[PDB]
Design a protein around this ligand. Structure first.
Ligand code: CL
Ligand code: CL
Ligand code: CL
Ligand code: K
Length: 164
């Protein structure tokens, strides 16, 4: 397991524009296009992202390119953020992947606001951090995925991703 395999598991792969768990237009491996309710706006974002006039459909190679860019962007966002960088630097490789996963799903600013959870992770209080992370809209809206990510923070292992 690695961060790419982890997020590919959590996000799936769809080659046509679809709505994500929040109802937002998305494509590929969890590539959010826009929060606008206009499908036309989403298609314009897609064409700009891919560099060609798409019919709302992309190839697997194109989806993997957006995915590479999005994983890179999540890491870059962590490293530029004064709240997330010290936490990331303090973590082992598996827990770093868990933090990248959260930033991929909800964005740098969203995760950086988890002040109490971030402190517990920095302190390596893994069971306490896991309990605190579950007290969140994130956990309530996507509980199976949040449980997998939380288990990764709690244990420092890939146990939540092995049998799937
Ligand atoms: Cl708590
Ligand atoms: Cl809550
Ligand atoms: Cl879920
Ligand atoms: K998805």
């Amino acid at each position: 397991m690695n961060i790419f395999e982890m997020l590919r598991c959590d996000e799936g792969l769809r080659l046509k524009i679809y709505k994500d768990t929040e109802g937002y237009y998305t494509i590929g491996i969890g590539h959010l296009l826009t929060k606008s309710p206009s499908l036309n706006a989403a298609k314009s974002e897609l064409d700009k992202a891919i560099g060609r006039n798409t019919n709302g459909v992309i190839t697997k190679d194109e989806a993997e390119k957006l995915f590479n860019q999005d994983v890179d962007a999540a890491v870059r966002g962590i490293l530029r953020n004064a709240k997330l960088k010290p936490v990331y630097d303090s973590l082992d490789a598996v827990r770093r992947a868990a933090l990248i996963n959260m930033v991929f799903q909800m964005g740098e600013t969203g995760v950086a606001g988890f002040t109490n959870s971030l402190r517990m992770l920095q302190q390596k209080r893994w069971d306490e951090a896991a309990c605190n992370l579950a007290k969140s809209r994130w956990y309530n809206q996507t509980p199976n995925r949040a449980k997998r990510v939380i288990t990764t923070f709690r244990t420092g292992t890939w146990d939540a991703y092995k049998n799937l």
